[PDB]
Amino acid sequence: SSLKLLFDEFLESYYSDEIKDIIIKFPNKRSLPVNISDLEEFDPDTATNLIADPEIIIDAANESLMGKLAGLNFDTYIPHVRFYNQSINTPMVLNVGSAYINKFVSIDALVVKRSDIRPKIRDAVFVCTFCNAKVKANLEKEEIPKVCPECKKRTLKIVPEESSFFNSQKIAVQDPLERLSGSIPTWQLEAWLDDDLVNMAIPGDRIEISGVLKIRPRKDSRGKVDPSIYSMYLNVTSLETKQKEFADIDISEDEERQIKELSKDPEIFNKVTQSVAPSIYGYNEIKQAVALQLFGGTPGKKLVDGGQIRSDMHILLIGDPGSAKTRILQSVSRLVPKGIYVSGKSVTGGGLTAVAERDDFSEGGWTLKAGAMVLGNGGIVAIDQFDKISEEDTAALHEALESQTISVAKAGIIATFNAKASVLAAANPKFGRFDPAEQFDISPTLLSRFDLIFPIRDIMDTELDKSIANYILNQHEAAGAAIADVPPIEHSLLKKYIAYAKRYVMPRLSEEASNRIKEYYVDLRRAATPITPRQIEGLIRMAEASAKSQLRDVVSVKDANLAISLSEYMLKTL
Amino acid sequence: QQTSSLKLLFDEFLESYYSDEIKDIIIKFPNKRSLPVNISDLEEFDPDTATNLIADPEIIIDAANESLMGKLAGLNFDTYIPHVRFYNQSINTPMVLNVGSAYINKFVSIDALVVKRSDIRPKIRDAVFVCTFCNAKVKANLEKEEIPKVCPECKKRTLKIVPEESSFFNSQKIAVQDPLERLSGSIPTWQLEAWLDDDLVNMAIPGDRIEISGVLKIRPRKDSRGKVDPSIYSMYLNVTSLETKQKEFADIDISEDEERQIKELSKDPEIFNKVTQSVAPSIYGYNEIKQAVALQLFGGTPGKKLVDGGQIRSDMHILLIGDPGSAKTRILQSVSRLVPKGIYVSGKSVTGGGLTAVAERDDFSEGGWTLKAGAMVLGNGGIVAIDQFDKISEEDTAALHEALESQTISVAKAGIIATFNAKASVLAAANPKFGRFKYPAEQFDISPTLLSRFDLIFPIRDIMDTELDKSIANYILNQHEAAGAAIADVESSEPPIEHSLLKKYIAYAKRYVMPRLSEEASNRIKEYYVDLRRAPITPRQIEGLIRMAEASAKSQLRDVVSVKDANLAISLSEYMLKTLAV
Ligand SMILES: Nc1ncnc2c1ncn2[C@@H]1O[C@H](COP(=O)(O)OP(=O)(O)O)[C@@H](O)[C@H]1O
Ligand SMILES: Nc1ncnc2c1ncn2[C@@H]1O[C@H](COP(=O)(O)OP(=O)(O)O)[C@@H](O)[C@H]1O
Ligand SMILES: [Zn+2]
Ligand SMILES: [Zn+2]
Secondary structure: OHHHHHHHHHHHHHHHHHHHHHHHHOOOOOEEEEEHHHHHHHOHHHHHHHHHOHHHHHHHHHHHHHHHOOOOOOOOOOOEEEEEOOOOOOOOHHHOOHHHOOOEEEEEEEEEEEOOOOOEEOEEEEEEOOOOOEEEEEOOOOOOOOOOOOOOOOOEEEOHHHOOEEOEEEEEEEOOHHHOOOOOOOOOEEEEEEHHHOOOOOOOOEEEEEEEEEEEEEEOOOOOEEEEEEEEEEEEEEEEOOOOOHHHOOOOHHHHHHHHHHHOOOOHHHHHHHOOOOOOOOOHHHHHHHHHHHHOOOOOOEOOOOOEOOOOOOEEEEOOOOOOHHHHHHHHHHHOOOOEEEEOOOOOOOOOOOOOOEOOOOHHHEOOOOOOOOOOOOOEEEEEOHHHOOHHHHHHHHHHHHOOEEEEEEOOEEEEEEOOOEEEEEEOOOOOOOOOHHHOOOOHHHHOOOOEEEEOOOOOOHHHHHHHHHHHHHHHHHHHHHHHOOOOOOHHHHHHHHHHHHHHOOOEEOHHHHHHHHHHHHHHHOOOOOOOOHHHHHHHHHHHHHHHHOOOOEEOHHHHHHHHHHHHHHHHOO | OHHHHHHHHHHHHHHHHHHHHHHHHHHHOOOOOEEEEEHHHHHHHOHHHHHHHHHOHHHHHHHHHHHHHHHOOOOOOOOOOOEEEEEOOOOOOOOOOOOOHHHOOOEEEEEEEEEEEOOOOOEEOEEEEEEOOOOOEEEEEOOOOOOOOOOOOOOOOOEEEOHHHOOEEOEEEEEEEOOOOOOOOOOOOOOEEEEEEHHHOOOOOOOOEEEEEEEEEEEEEEOOOOOEEEEEEEEEEEEEEEEOOOOOOOOOOOOHHHHHHHHHHHHOOOHHHHHHOOOOOOOOOOHHHHHHHHHHHHOOOOOOEOOOOOEOOOOOOEEEEEOOOOOHHHHHHHHHHHOOOOEEEEOOOOOOOOOOOOOOEOOOOOOOEOOOOOOOOOOOOOEEEEEOHHHOOHHHHHHHHHHHHHOEEEEEEOOEEEEEEOOOEEEEEEOOOOOOOOOHHHHOOOOHHHHOOOOEEEEEOOOOOHHHHHHHHHHHHHHHHHHHHHHOOOOOOOOOOOHHHHHHHHHHHHHHOOOEEOHHHHHHHHHHHHHHHOOOOOOHHHHHHHHHHHHHHHOOOOOEEOHHHHHHHHHHHHHHHHHHHO
8 A cells, every 4th residue: 555655645745736626526527637747756766667567556546546535426437647748758659669568658649540439348247147146347457257156157248237337449649740751651559548538639639648558469361369479559548738729728727817917018919919920020010910810809799690700810911932921821820829831732622621521431421531721620720822722722712711611512411511710821923023912813702801911012121131131140140059059928828828818808899999990991981902891890800809919808999990000001002 | 116106107297298299199090109208398297207217218218108008098009109209308418429438328319410321121029939849939029128049948049030920110220420510620430320210210311410319328349350349339329209400491380379470470561571671680781682582582382383284483593793792691691591401502513513413323332322412402492502603613504504494403324314303492692703893794604594594683783882881880880799798798789570480480371371373463564574575585584573473472471462562573673674784
């Protein structure tokens, strides 16, 4: 019991508040994530033992947590201690081997496949066919029993109506393609998720998956067992998505205070604005707009007929080569938690607006088709080379930008795929260099969808050129220095702040601001681009975003004036 | 003992709540043998038995069936059996993705897209068995007992089922997943098995969205080589009820109270105006368009046949060509939401994935037919809103002529010659060629021939009136303002007709009202044409006129078409011409 007693101290010390939370929320919340850093700080021997004999250590910790969870019902569910974050055994999926057998390993994983939920028995009950006795067994702690204890015949039959079940699942995992020097490996590591872990590793996610490597006798093409060759499978203990979509970002109580204090900074917006694309000089108006976009407009609005109104914003940059269009796109994609960067050029059936169709000879009955727009999941999809867009994509992006859906009527299925995303597109103009609206090669009906369209021109002011040059060198000098070994807001905080603002601030239009926007519209109508009612919605969106940028629940005329300002800047470049 | 008590509880509950329904089942047995039972009513009667449904569904469902048989004493249950089918609960509403071990042998209700359905497979319930060694007859219900494997008298494994002395009941396997509108990312690579028995069979057609309820079950999982896994199991739902929450116009149910309610609407002079104001609330203006959409929602008199036994189209087709930002998509989308099962689809297609796609015989495909069905084939009489009609593929362009006129798609391919049914009221919308809007007709890339098939073409233009801009601006701002205030539950400042009532009103008018032209109205249209003809106008305009006027009669639950209706058809027609001139 030494270990259990060891863990009792440990758990109480480092995770007492968390354990209390579990006591309240059990069985709905039933797992305790435990950093291994803490455990190695608390007993470096225990932590080292964990890596080489994890099953015995993990069992002890789970028993300790069950003890601290005193007075609760464990007839149906069992508490789980889920250790994560270690750096001793961090192999690549391709390099997992015999050295990690029955050892704890953490791997950077791309989830490729996920199976159906397959109920598995834990507290089992068996009946003897011959002598009718009932034998009980715990399949998570001993092997499936084989003989009746009274008549001694090998005749024990499982009775599932009297046994307990817990979820289980098989996933296929691979190395992220970003970590491979050459061609893709032709195999995937099998992994098993149990209980609450299930359906927490969707295909396409990148998760640090941790657990215990295990082996099993190999079965060949015919199912014939091996002479002495084994296959491998990892039993997962924890799952850490290091980088998390805004909605899944976890904000702590202390962090919640911290974010709120940031709100009171009267320059908070300009700090967010400066973190958009720090590597490039200038383009302050572009950045401001990208900053408004990150926060987005007020979500969850319905029209009188129940038609949901778009909050996400769309921005199209147009310019010549060397206009830092790719770099901005790529930088914004890195800032956002889950960001997509994709080129417009597509092969038919490999578009941005790709959606699954129905194939009876495919797994699940649906083809494995999904483009950037359906994988957006509310984030920013940075589409470079927007001019290269296919005709199929061009037509589908109308609905995708406006309604944030992709509707299909094919193979007897009527469906509307969900395509929420904030597009930051970039396009070079027709015939290379600029001469403004006419030379884009983007449809006028699709341009309408974008809220702000900022054309970028090269004024070639020499003083400006000298400033640019100065900046660029500086960066390089610095980078060089870093190899030699001689920020407005921190990134992590920045994301959390935005996540908080998107989750808990829903700006609502004041009368004064509504009236300012109305006046600007009508004035604009008086006397290249058609100024339809559409533009009014864009001004609402942007203004609402300014409010959400300061964590304010009401749109001011100050907000509306930032929106009208960015509009007018777009308009200045005729 | 406990089962007896349960039977009496159910007797009382069924007399109190479902007396009339049980009597209808007595009259029409076996053709009608299923009693839908809303759980909410069992909530009320004894909440404890309602919780026991979710926890021990099979015990109390078998009890309720037992009771319902008791209430149907005297009827012959040799072939068919009555069924109690519970629905409407909200305690266990899992997603198909997340269904799991917590619901094993428990009641669950799932929002489901049917994807596959199997062949009907007869299955034995009241089975007879005979022994090859001692000729002993063993009887058993196989839904309650397992299959006898060893003869009781002769004690050997020789039992043999006798199909000629056994009873049978239909069974069907269906495949189900979550609606794609509910998934957040990629489609799961799996889909849940469900089983339909007796009268539930062929009530889950591929493509339907049905709230499916039943008891989740487990079966031992088999390997790729048929070897059972040790403690690993597979899931499958034994469906006990199907509730279609959407319901197309014809399947919609109308209570007597509703009938009373609906009729009263009919007497108000401005019902049509009121309806016309329910079409696209979110948009401001577009009244003529709204009026037409309103007339399209009712349609002309169905069942008209020509002297030669042909069919006369009753459904109306509308096209809206306008500039970007002229609210085209929203109207299309709003109308699609209002109608029960509406399709909204883009005109852009790939070869073999068009609006007029139809099945093609193919032996290599499952079932001897390809999985091909577009919006027109799936229209089931609803409104099929096709945006970006200027991007229609040549193949679709050609097939839509016949689909719009004859409401059929005919084919002679793979040795099969047949005519698919494509009944639908299209509400198309297109942008002009070379972007922004001389002769309007030349401005858009649509064949003249295909344009002849629409009854109404509404061009939309910007008249740039400042006051109109002012008016619109106020209108939009007010809308948003209100929505934002609602998110916070503080109000600072209502369809003329409730949505459900409007749906049922239209459904009623479509079932029962069948307008017949009066000579008064007939003459006005009859004259109209000729005068219009003086100084591209064809005879089909008259047909459109008739349809629209008949629809104005149906809009007011009137069996006769008045001249007043004819005038309204003329006015819309007039508007189109005026607008289309130059
Ligand atoms: N303010 C700036 N304006 C323009 N270019 C800049 C600025 N700051 C840095 N650059 C340089 O511009 C180039 C980035 O352009 P990028 O988008 O990658 O190419 P392209 O625009 O043609 O796609 C880089 O050479 C970068 O160093
Ligand atoms: N009352 C109105 N009158 C005119 N236009 C409106 C009105 N209300 C909204 N709009 C705007 O008109 C747009 C409809 O898009 P749409 O015109 O269909 O584009 P396209 O013409 O390219 O299909 C919407 O984005 C909407 O914001
Ligand atoms: Zn025994
Ligand atoms: Zn026998």
